[PDB]
Design a protein around this ligand. Structure first.
Ligand SMILES: *[C@@H]1O[C@H](CO)[C@@H](O)[C@H](O)[C@H]1NC(C)=O
Lengths: 36, 49
């Protein structure tokens, strides 16, 4: 009874705070539109 | 060539988190609104506050 993902698993990467920063990252994160 | 020491280690982290730890010196009181250098909590810089 699987179920697809739409928008989940979005977390600020660290305690640091950026501000209006169109930034990019990479680590062990959630693959998108996958089915939990 | 195996005289005894019980190994000891450094600890260190690179800004990726809250700032909490350092051996307190005089720990001055702050000023503002006048471009003066700060060694603010170990993180240093010049400019205004
Ligand atoms: C999600 O992926 C599984 C594996 O192929 C598939 O069976 C399912 O139909 C997909 N869609 C869902 C669960 O909505």
């Amino acid at each position: 009874a699987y179920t697809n993902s739409f928008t989940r698993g979005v977390y600020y990467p660290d305690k640091v705070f950026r501000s209006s920063v169109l930034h990019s990252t990479q680590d062990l994160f959630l693959p998108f539109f996958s089915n939990v | 060539g195996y005289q005894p020491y019980r190994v000891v280690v450094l600890s260190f982290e690179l800004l990726h988190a809250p700032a909490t730890v350092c051996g307190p010196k005089k720990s001055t009181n702050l000023v503002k609104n006048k471009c003066v250098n700060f060694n603010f909590n170990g993180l240093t810089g010049t400019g205004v506050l």
